[PDB]
């Protein structure tokens, strides 16, 4: 299975999950996958940096 891109992130409650858009599936077929299922470290880093910037934007608002 190859991750094309990550769509979202959640943590319940110790366990982290990622909404994964799979290569060869349409966008609406993305599925939630626990961190250990995934090998795509570059994509994870880019995803996290992107989200970090958005939370920082929000932190500054306050």
Author numbering: 43 to 104
From the manuscript:
However, it exists as a monomer in solution. The fold is composed of an N-terminal SH3-like β-barrel, followed by a long C-terminal helix α1(residues 82–100). The β-barrel consists of a sheet with three antiparalled strands β1 (residues 45–53), β2 (residues 58–64) and β3 (residues 73–76). Interestingly, the chromodomain of the human SUV39H1 we crystallized lacks the first aromatic residue F43 of the aromatic cage. Thus the two aromatic residues, W64 and Y67, in the loop between β2 and β3 form a partial aromatic cage, which is a conserved structural feature among chromodomain proteins and other Royal family members. This may implicate that the cage structural element is not essential for fold stability. We purified two SUV39H1 constructs including the one used for crystallization (aa 44–106) and the one containing a complete aromatic cage (aa 42–100). By means of fluorescence polarization assay, we found that the partial chromodomain does not show detectable binding to any histone H3K9 peptides.
SUV39H1 is the first identified histone lysine methyltransferase (HMT) in human. It catalyzes di- and tri-methylation of lysine 9 of histone H3, which are related to chromatin packaging and gene silencing. SUV39H1 possesses a chromodomain at its N-terminus and a SET domain at its C-terminus. Although the SET domain performs the catalytic activity, the chromodomain of SUV39H1 is vital for the catalytic activity of SUV39H1.
